[PDB]
Design an enzyme around this catalytic site. Structure first.
Site, PDB file in Angstrom:
ATOM      1  N   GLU A  32       0.788  -1.033  -0.031  1.00  0.00           N
ATOM      2  CA  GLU A  32      -0.099  -0.070   0.003  1.00  0.00           C
ATOM      3  C   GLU A  32       0.785   1.210   0.051  1.00  0.00           C
ATOM      4  O   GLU A  32       1.963   1.093   0.437  1.00  0.00           O
ATOM      5  CB  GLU A  32      -0.916   0.043   1.298  1.00  0.00           C
ATOM      6  CG  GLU A  32      -0.075   0.511   2.359  1.00  0.00           C
ATOM      7  CD  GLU A  32      -1.240   0.352   3.494  1.00  0.00           C
ATOM      8  OE1 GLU A  32      -2.117  -0.734   3.586  1.00  0.00           O
ATOM      9  OE2 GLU A  32      -0.982   1.132   4.615  1.00  0.00           O
ATOM     10  N   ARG A 105     -14.327   4.879  -8.295  1.00  0.00           N
ATOM     11  CA  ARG A 105     -13.067   4.375  -8.296  1.00  0.00           C
ATOM     12  C   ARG A 105     -12.778   3.259  -7.404  1.00  0.00           C
ATOM     13  O   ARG A 105     -12.328   2.378  -7.482  1.00  0.00           O
ATOM     14  CB  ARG A 105     -11.963   5.447  -8.015  1.00  0.00           C
ATOM     15  CG  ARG A 105     -10.672   5.232  -7.685  1.00  0.00           C
ATOM     16  CD  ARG A 105      -9.562   6.370  -7.519  1.00  0.00           C
ATOM     17  NE  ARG A 105      -8.173   5.932  -7.569  1.00  0.00           N
ATOM     18  CZ  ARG A 105      -7.517   5.857  -6.216  1.00  0.00           C
ATOM     19  NH1 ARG A 105      -8.178   5.904  -5.034  1.00  0.00           N
ATOM     20  NH2 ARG A 105      -6.342   5.459  -6.479  1.00  0.00           N
ATOM     21  N   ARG A 186     -18.603  19.293  -8.689  1.00  0.00           N
ATOM     22  CA  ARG A 186     -19.141  17.885  -8.818  1.00  0.00           C
ATOM     23  C   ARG A 186     -20.278  17.713  -8.058  1.00  0.00           C
ATOM     24  O   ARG A 186     -20.451  18.084  -6.993  1.00  0.00           O
ATOM     25  CB  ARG A 186     -18.116  16.738  -8.375  1.00  0.00           C
ATOM     26  CG  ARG A 186     -16.880  16.674  -9.509  1.00  0.00           C
ATOM     27  CD  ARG A 186     -16.038  15.587  -8.965  1.00  0.00           C
ATOM     28  NE  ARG A 186     -16.597  14.394  -9.149  1.00  0.00           N
ATOM     29  CZ  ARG A 186     -16.223  13.291  -8.431  1.00  0.00           C
ATOM     30  NH1 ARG A 186     -14.953  13.251  -8.046  1.00  0.00           N
ATOM     31  NH2 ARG A 186     -16.864  12.130  -8.455  1.00  0.00           N
ATOM     32  N   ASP A 308      -0.544   7.091 -12.705  1.00  0.00           N
ATOM     33  CA  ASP A 308      -0.441   8.525 -12.320  1.00  0.00           C
ATOM     34  C   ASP A 308       0.818   9.015 -11.814  1.00  0.00           C
ATOM     35  O   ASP A 308       1.371  10.079 -11.855  1.00  0.00           O
ATOM     36  CB  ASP A 308      -1.493   8.991 -11.453  1.00  0.00           C
ATOM     37  CG  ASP A 308      -2.702   9.236 -12.028  1.00  0.00           C
ATOM     38  OD1 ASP A 308      -3.043   8.929 -13.345  1.00  0.00           O
ATOM     39  OD2 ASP A 308      -3.784   9.701 -11.190  1.00  0.00           O
ATOM     40  N   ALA A 321      -7.033   6.782 -16.616  1.00  0.00           N
ATOM     41  CA  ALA A 321      -7.077   5.270 -16.231  1.00  0.00           C
ATOM     42  C   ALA A 321      -6.442   4.304 -17.159  1.00  0.00           C
ATOM     43  O   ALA A 321      -5.975   3.571 -16.977  1.00  0.00           O
ATOM     44  CB  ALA A 321      -8.260   5.045 -15.582  1.00  0.00           C
TER      45      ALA A 321
END
Length: 418
Positions: A32, A105, A186, A308, A321
């Protein structure tokens, strides 16, 4: 055999790990990185090239479980283009067999993670030290464990900690996210609510069921239906192209709550359809859109950047993506090859840097230019609606219809393979 470590549990990192575990000669561990939220920006979508990579990686089942696609008979429409002043039709962009495909996502990452075999994910710990010497990388973690591998994949997002290791090792200047000067409101609107709002101003109900983009000077608004058409996702872009080349406060997250008043005021002077749509948005948020510069190289020794971390971009071509998925498919096909060993790994990484980086950097550049086109700032098109509508229908084909297997065939020929 090959020992491969991947840092970053995003789409690109988990996708690469899922395919790399299918080969018996490869041992993979997934670690992670720092979690993200404000970095999501305008969201995640999948173009035709992205779904092709997803299938090539064997991730079609997880993709079908969570992805959102427009209902028949508009399944192939990417966007309809409209004037922001009167919602008049300018043209449309068609993506046959794909159309407008998007996802929450976290839904897709969670779906991919559940398919990981046992023992691949090594979550709950963070890397504190990364060193390499003589073709091996050593990574020290917060729990005292150490992982050493022949290759370390940096898939830790736009604020990648491993990018500095790659840029320093190659002696290049450091690269941090750059504020584009574009902010995006958004929100989501119930489809029936938007229909009644459109009908009250004499607006066609067609504009609710089909993905739309309303174009104007220094701004544009996109909508598309999700959840079988019961909810309309909305992103309203505002760009400041004034002198300063603006900045974002260093102590400010890239997302904040927005007031309804400031959102409606920002689109004062827009048409009835655009303003009626924005009035339907509950609890709006504002997002500061960032991207990354085009890096001169993605590789330093046995550490390589993907996604990214290597090529964060603006969302105007829905390509972010998909470029990370193209990275995963390209690398997993070469690494999964029988002829791949630690002896030719540096050669393999040079093929990735020579064949994946030039395309990804071109997508970064064209994503910014596409945003200029949306907002009537293209130096040639301007506000020429006939030229604007014609170019919007064709300018995405080089991205969507690229055959990644021709790049792989060129990589093998450079490696003297097969």
């Amino acid at each position: 055999g090959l020992r491969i470590g991947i840092v970053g549990g995003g789409i690109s990192g988990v996708a690469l790990a899922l395919e790399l575990c299918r080969y018996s000669h490869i041992q993979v561990q997934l670690f992670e990185a720092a979690p993200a939220f404000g970095e999501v920006g305008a969201g995640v979508s999948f173009g035709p090239n992205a779904v092709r990579a997803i299938v090539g990686l064997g991730l079609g089942e997880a993709y079908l479980q969570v992805a959102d696609r427009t209902s028949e008979p508009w399944e192939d429409v990417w966007f309809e283009w409209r004037r922001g002043s009167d919602a008049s039709y300018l043209g449309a962009t068609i993506a046959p067999g794909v159309g407008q495909s998007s996802v929450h996502r976290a839904d897709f990452i969670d779906a991919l993670v559940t398919h990981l075999p046992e023992g691949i994910a090594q979550f709950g710990k963070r890397a504190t030290q990364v060193e390499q010497q003589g073709g091996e990388v050593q990574v020290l973690f917060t729990d005292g464990t150490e992982y050493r591998c022949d290759l370390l994949i940096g898939a830790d997002g736009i604020k990648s900690a491993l990018r500095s290791h790659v840029l320093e090792g190659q002696g290049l200047a450091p690269q941090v996210p750059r504020f584009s000067g574009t902010c995006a409101y958004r929100g989501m609107v119930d489809s029936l609510h938007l229909r009644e709002a459109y009908r009250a101003h004499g607006i066609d109900e067609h504009l609710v069921d089909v993905p739309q983009m309303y174009l104007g000077l220094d701004g544009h608004i996109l909508t598309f239906p999700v959840r079988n058409g019961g909810i309309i996702n909305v992103v309203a872009f505002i760009s400041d192209r004034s002198e300063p080349k603006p900045t974002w406060p260093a102590d400010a997250p890239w997302v904040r709550e927005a007031s309804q008043r400031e959102m409606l005021d920002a689109f004062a002077g827009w048409g009835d359809a655009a303003r009626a749509l924005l009035e339907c948005i509950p609890a709006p948020t504002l997002w500061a859109l960032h991207d990354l510069a085009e890096l001169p190289g993605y590789v330093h020794g046995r550490v390589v950047l993907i996604g990214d971390a290597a090529h964060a971009m603006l969302p105007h071509q829905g390509a972010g993506a998909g470029q990370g998925l193209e990275d995963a498919y390209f690398l997993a096909r070469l690494l999964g090859d029988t002829q791949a060993d630690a002896g030719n790994l540096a050669e393999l990484l040079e093929a990735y840097d020579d064949l994946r980086r030039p395309r990804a950097c071109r997508v970064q550049q064209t994503s910014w230019e596409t945003g200029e086109l949306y907002e009537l700032r293209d130096p040639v098109v301007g506000a020429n609606e006939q030229l604007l509508g014609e170019n919007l229908a064709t300018r995405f084909d080089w991205l969507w219809n690229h055959d990644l297997d021709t790049d792989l065939a060129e990589a093998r020929a450079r490696l003297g393979w097969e």
